[model samples]
Target: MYAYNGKLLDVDLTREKVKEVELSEDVLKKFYGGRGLGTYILWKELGEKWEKVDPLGEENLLLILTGPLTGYYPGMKTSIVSKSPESNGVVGSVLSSELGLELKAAGYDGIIIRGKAKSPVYLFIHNDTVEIRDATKYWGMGGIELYKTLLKEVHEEIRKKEKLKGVPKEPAMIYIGKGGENKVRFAAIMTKLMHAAGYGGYGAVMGSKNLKAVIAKGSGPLPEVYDKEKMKVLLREFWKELFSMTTFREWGTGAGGYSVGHDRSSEPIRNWQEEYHDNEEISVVNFENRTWIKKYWADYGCPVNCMKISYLRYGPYKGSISDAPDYELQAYMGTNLGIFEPEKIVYLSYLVDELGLDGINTGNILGFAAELYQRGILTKEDLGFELNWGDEKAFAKLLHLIVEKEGIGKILAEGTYRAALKISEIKGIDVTKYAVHVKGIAVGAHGIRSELDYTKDISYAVSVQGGDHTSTAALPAKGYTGELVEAFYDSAVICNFVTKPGFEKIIEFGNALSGFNITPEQWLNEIGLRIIHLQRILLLLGGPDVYWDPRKDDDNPPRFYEPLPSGPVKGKAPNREDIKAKVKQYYEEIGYDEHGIPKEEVLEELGIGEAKREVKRIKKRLN
Candidate 1:
């Protein structure tokens, strides 16, 4: 077994016991690691049963997994799998960088948690030992507070020991803040300093399980390759190529500064109601001018430090810091909410991070609520607190209420889908039309209608999992081939931001790490295809796979499709006919049948020959 220390740590809250499960060669070889293993395990354990289980139920499994290449290599990201609290289906939240290194150092491949704890508790993993301890003193604390407290505890332990090695004394803690504890369906997982796994609301799952935090520390070296010097040379070459690329340089800078900012003409203004325009106050020029404070850095060990980390220098909330309020946050919270002050947006970004809420989804829900309030459909009395658009105090208060689960916040915690349903019930209005969601999960800032149309892709509509942006990002290969290359990057456990040459470098690194001669092309052509197929099988198992009407469901909020009504792309809306056409094209490209289900031949070809039999089994169960 080569003394595999990278075991699977399984914690059953219901049984209140922890066990280490050995990783089989078949599992390792077939799935690789990170998101790949996570999807496989989710398929094996939950599969069709995912739809039947409550997203936050005891049966729901949370997989916090790191790839075999993580920590040993620089660009490998961590990935998490769980039935989404946001979308109510399987979701792989790619979160590599710091957390993966932490988990690897802690001597585990991954941690699988199930069931709810009796009380608020945190898990401390030190090498082979895992303990669930009382978090009574730390309950209800903000993300930063919880982080500091855990850091202090780890420091004390290190000081007592006189010497600590391998793992840093501070340790790496993954925890949910107020938003998570409140079980807000749009909650997010916070790690490192400001890094987040924001899309699927897995943080709410942590809260529902009554998990306060998971702290891990380890000592000793990770498994190493036989040829160390060769690996070093390969890594250096890749790093050089990665830094030399234009895409890598521009990574998270967004379409703001580049000619693309004006060229693409996709700057979302006012909840994606408008297109690109010169809004100097919140424009890319302002970001560059305030670069001293607004300057940011990507995750640690990242060769290309693309993402920024801005600081609020002057404001009521001065000295607060936050990650690069990227295009998504800039659009969702700044222009979308009609707040033009970058400083204010930065502060709000910090607030969401500290509260552990998904900035994109939170902004979506708040925008909906603000519109409702403006239209006289909702009043301050109904909200239990005053809410006015662009009011920082009001916005902050609403976020607090949502995190605290106070009065209306309870319904809001159910997510915008359910929240809008409740609003419609109370106001006797159809709220669904205004709400921007896909399968109950709020959509990201890029209004679906304005961006590259993805309404009909099986990966988008009939995803074995749910409405994940990454599931069908198809960003890297957008114009080049329209192939799902990003999925290949994810499957190869490579960070998507790394340049094309960097991807090949990752394959070299992987070969060095695992002694497997797998190339990047192999990942895209084989591994990625296989993983996507497995995900499809898992969804088929869940039964009633298609929920939303594909024709209508993949469309963005009505406001987006209704033309810019102003701006550069004036009177232009993403053409619905074009979107539908793209859907049909995407289906053909992915080898799905006209109805969006995987064709029997496609399933058989993908080494999922048994999928046909399994679908029948699922159909019988559903019947």
Candidate 2:
């Protein structure tokens, strides 16, 4: 097979051992790579009682896998795979960096770091060499220090040894901050300037493993591809289509936070109590014009410079700086908490980025706390301080508390779900309806209202990844087909921003890499079905620890049921029955039963009945 290193590196931190395992030809072809391969490995290693896996425990396998087209492709995203602390299901979030490419250059398709380090440590991997180094001195340092220092050190070493210039072709460094160190359920790994493996709390998983950082650089030969000439033609056309995507290039996803209130009544403010707030100064466009520091951030291969840096020149947060705040950050930390000051939001954005916290979860927890105070569900005596809306200093104290796990921050640091359980006991207030989450993972910036409809709903409700709108759906054949195609993109490791969704483009890239030409019909009819089915099955088998029940859990939070207070689309809320009906329809389209379980015949048809026929199973067979 072309474009595979044909081996996966297994690092056992507990034993301080490193080993290599051969990649199965059948499995590689079936899953391809990236998250697809990750799912395959998830089943192979942890499927026996997959639902029983403790997400933050040492047994939870953390795999960073690359694809056949990783370095060769424009979109640089690696799959960070493990059981999720957020969802307790099949969790695979993407880390956008050349780390995926660097590992592939290091003569391995992936690295599986399992078990916990006896003490704090970091993993250093280069071609045919590995070391588990002591990280005691670097343990408490922030992500910014570690990120800048490691990249500088790695390139210096590479240039001195190999006579290279500037940042080495093989350079990637990943680490977490205080949030991960404290084992916050929503911590993320900081990498490549400001990129992160954000959602799944994989950084906490890494921190739980006592792993501080992973620095990688490889000076070795790349895998030979099937058709070099074909690769050239395919890339030219790929970039041709990618460059023409002028909309993303112009604005990118950076300023997506602004559209929530501007377009509709979907911006969640003061928790989900209000979807729209009449504020203009905190607007995305307005923020950029005044405060943006012209950072001009982009990933490894793409030309679209959409990421913008924000500077706080004068304010309570005067010295704060941010790395191109995303819509999630803006929604969660900005408007959601009843704060409209762009400087405060930008400061908190930088705070979470440095502390290695997931912005969505951070904002959600903060908003949840604010709502508690507003509803008299919590008192100043309980909080030890007031959590008023638009109070930057008050919220800043809460942010630090979450990181340090002190006072009420300790209860809140467990995230909204666990915090609710604790707060319910202490405050005697059932906070379920107002919690505003699905499967414990905080929903993204887009709220379930008509203004920012989020592909008109059904994305979060039925998403196998739990609240992830990245691979979202509303209708079958088109919407559900997008999820299937997103599975392919994650496997092929390409960015959807460049090319929306096209079978021809994806398959052509595959054909160029593998030299195995399969018609697009086979890609859709057979290969696509295989990937989606396996993902669906894995998701179904998720979390013996979680409270996931398709019938009950496959619905939006109670906050979404409340009427949208104000916006262009007034009195709008997702219809409970209406959304549930469509979510069931989406399940049917995905070849699952109405309750979201895959049919026996469908599994057989997808040629993955081996999940059932083999020793044990891929799914736990709960249904």
Candidate 3:
């Protein structure tokens, strides 16, 4: 057996002790890595009672994992798996590429964080040693400020100690912000300036644990196949393929620039109320002028360097800067909120980032509030602050309130779904009609109601992990065929941005890394099915019956289903019946019953024969 440094770092924050577990071959082979490995650990640790555990409690496990291929390969994505505080279910928030690399260097496959600390603390991993340090001074700092302070601290420590040589002076840090401190259900985990694992509210979990940040540095190189030269050749070929592709070259770094318009994946104006905004003045192109600051060709290994460090130039908050306001932010805060000024959007993005809030959910909740205020449902007295569309100053103040949990912000911090429920109770306005979320998570701006049926159906139904758009994105012109293909890509441990070169290439890369001759077809058929089944099981663990209702569960922004009232696609609304029919078809196609659970035979066929038998036995007992 090869001596692998890859180990699982388990920290019991309540006990204030760290235990290291060796990575088993069974886990590496069966689960692969990243989300797969994290989920497997979660299932083994939490099991069937996982849903009953409070999302922010000590029982909730935060699995920060990297795949076997991560760090060794260029394009492999990093994932943070935990029971989401936002959706209150399973989620794997994709982290920055540097995270996996840092973990690998730190000589650990992953870190499993559990228990709650007595006081605010941060984890520092230096080589084989781990320290739980006091972080009281950094508790209220902005994400960027905290990161920079830690960076300085680490650098000073390294310079003072000769033993720290060979280790990188700057460590990769992941931290939360004021939004997390306020327990906003839609808080984000931020790293590398503005790269966020922006879904599932993992930040709230971190905050609940009293963990201010996780900082890591490693001097060791990632272990590779004994034959390193051959691996190099294959990686070079893969890198060439990645860079040569138009999609990779054009829209690789940040999401908004050209990919949105070219892919027709851009956020429609005003919460999809208008598919085509007459004012092109507020488009991504225009926004770039106000926000785009520093453009470097190569910051990291990304080929195209699509990232642009943007600055707030002409705003009242001039000089505020944030890394790339991707399409999601551009649309959610910019067009959706009826604010077209790019500089203002950039400032808002910074505020959200500094506060560690999910831009999508925050914008959705804010948009809902704005609409309510306009419709006489919410008055200035009720809000504690006047809210108007396109009022940047008021919007900024409201965001601060949300972060600080002041007055109306307390309800808003609970998330859009909960907020809507509260608003309905108070105003008798049936706010669920206006709320846009699937499984309690807010919908990202990928308004594809007309172009693709699969995107629409699976985005809500099979996105068992909740309202994440990337969980089931199917662009038509982009030539992605079906659910099978999507399942394959998501489970292949590669970023969706890099999955476009086809599955054959992915399998080839896997073979090189894992020394397994598993073909793409086998991956999609065997491992892909397992991933899908596990996700379905996780959802069932949440609440089988309540989790699978089409009538109640499937949702979109009220404006999306309503005609644009005016736009390029004029007077268009998604057909509810048609959407339901598609859902039915999808369920049937996946061999799921009406309740959306996998049929016994389907589970048996996917190599979980025992699970299938157990299901039958359970049903028999129930009967």
Candidate 4:
């Protein structure tokens, strides 16, 4: 049981019941932990009836989990797992926080939340003590207000307990804001004010359960490792490697938009009408000079420190504070919306963080709306204002309308893919041509057309978590280019930026911590493959509201096929023929059929009998 608490806390809010359950070694070793463990649990509990389960209903389970590396690693992360409102499939979204470390220190590897609370409530965990407390007064507050209120309340409660007195540590928490409260389809789960698990739409899932927050404060040490001497040596070596990521530590991900946009010609611009922007004024160096208050901010134990705080003291957005709008935010909320001002991007970034919305999803939808306006598909009569690119006032107004679910914002709140369908139904014309998404999830800010960034042409097309640039799939399925390594990084619950390449090194670290003799072949071909296949099966079974036919949905958007009209790499575009060839090769590498469905024999080999039956049934229907 080294490197584990060997326990999971199960809570059923409908019955107001809470209990600790044992973690079987067999499951833990095979799945590893974090997202992998969460995926396995969801499939084991709900796989047979997945297509019938409503993502927003009480049937969905929210899993918050940590890996064996939680407290031992240089960087800290926690996986938020649930059936997504956006994708209608399993999503193991990640967050940067001390919550995982604190949860482990409180003597559990994870928490399983089931059922809905009749009234608004928040969960509080103080070591072995647990309570589901009413959050009636704090229900509709923004993230900034909630964090201050909850932290003070929890500290006061802990101070009253005799055994818990004199504990210097503060409670770490994850909660929702107005966006989640209103059940925006792409709402984000927030922690540390700005850090978020934004991709999965778990915030809406939390709102559906009438749960506001989960907080933990612990004084216990991390679970013991089997080889303390070996762990010590590994830590030294890992730190050395992590510390050497100097460029990232210096500029964070902020540098990418400037270089990738102008130098590489692959940053998304104006809703991806173009993949290049020659605006040198829109640079990270400009952020440093005008906005960034703290240049080097790190999560829990991270040495790379790839985070920054931006504060606007004087502007139309005076007093706004946020983490620097890093590359994705810079691209999505900045360039993709035709916004180039640093202060404006910082303000928009601040707005989404406070409102609990996914910046990537929100920005993508806003761009979609603006393009519709440009085409006269939407008008001022529809929006009650002009929706134009780089119009901060219009953008700000539209953001509020969406959060409030008023007018056209109601449909926009459904997310890009769903919104497009709704708008098309109303306007009676196909608007999906402007909606950039894959399998109901909007594409990430990275553009594949130029083929100059880390993303290859086939990356987004085959990812189980579609449109997530972080988990892009590429050639040599077992290597770093594919989702195999990303799955390992996510399941390991470590920051992707801090991980060293090569399985030998990483597996050695795992063995030193858990005393498991897991090899690279076992990790990729068995464990990673098992988790991925389970997710793939669930994605293909997408339910009541939306279903993705792999034949049609497994490809990039129409806009990406357009040439880069004005940049150093002008005329650059993804070759449809080459992409088709590469995608076919990738399917073969992963044991999937030409349609990207897992083969029946592959399911059997992965020890997933339930999935085998489901795939068989689905194939019969498809035939």
- Candidate 1 local Cα displacement, residue 304, angstroms: 1.9
Candidate 1 at residue 325, lDDT?
A: 66
> TM-score per candidate, in order?
0.88, 0.93, 0.91, 0.98
- Compose the digit string of candidate 1's lDDT tens values, residues 171-227: 667888888887888888877546677788888888888888887776656666646
Candidate 1 has a TM-score of 0.88
Write candidate 4's Cα lDDT for 1-623 as tens digits.
89999999999998999999999999988798888999998888888888888888998999999999888878889888999898888778899978889989989988999999999999998899989989998998887788678777787778777444575567888999899988999999998878889897899999999999999877799999989998888888888888888888989888876888888787778888887877877788998899999999998888889999989999789977788767888888888888988899889889989899998899999999999998999999999999888888798899999999999989999999999999999999999999888778888877887777778688888888998887888789886557887888788888888776355687778888898988888888988998888888888888669988877877888888888898877888888878888888888899899878898788888777668877875676577
Error of 1 at 262 (Å): 5.2
Cα lDDT tens digits, model 3, 184-215, are 88998887667778888888988889998888
Best by TM-score: 4
What root-mean-square deviation over C-alphas does model 4 reach? 1.3
Candidate order by lDDT, decreasing, is 4, 2, 3, 1
Model 3 misses residue 435 by how many Å?
Answer: 0.5
On the 0 to 100 scale, the lDDT of residue 418 in model 4 is 94
Q: RMSD, each candidate, Å?
A: 3.7, 2.7, 3.5, 1.3
Please report how far candidate 2 places residue 395 from its true position, in Å.
1.7
Candidate number with the higher TM-score (1 or 3): 3
**Candidate 1 local Cα displacement, residue 395, angstroms:** 1.5
The model with the greatest lDDT is: 4
- Locate the minimum summed-lDDT window of 10 residues in model 2: 613-622
Cα miss at 416, model 3 (Å)? 0.7
Candidate 4: regions farther than 4 A off: 162-165
Error of 4 at 111 (Å): 0.7
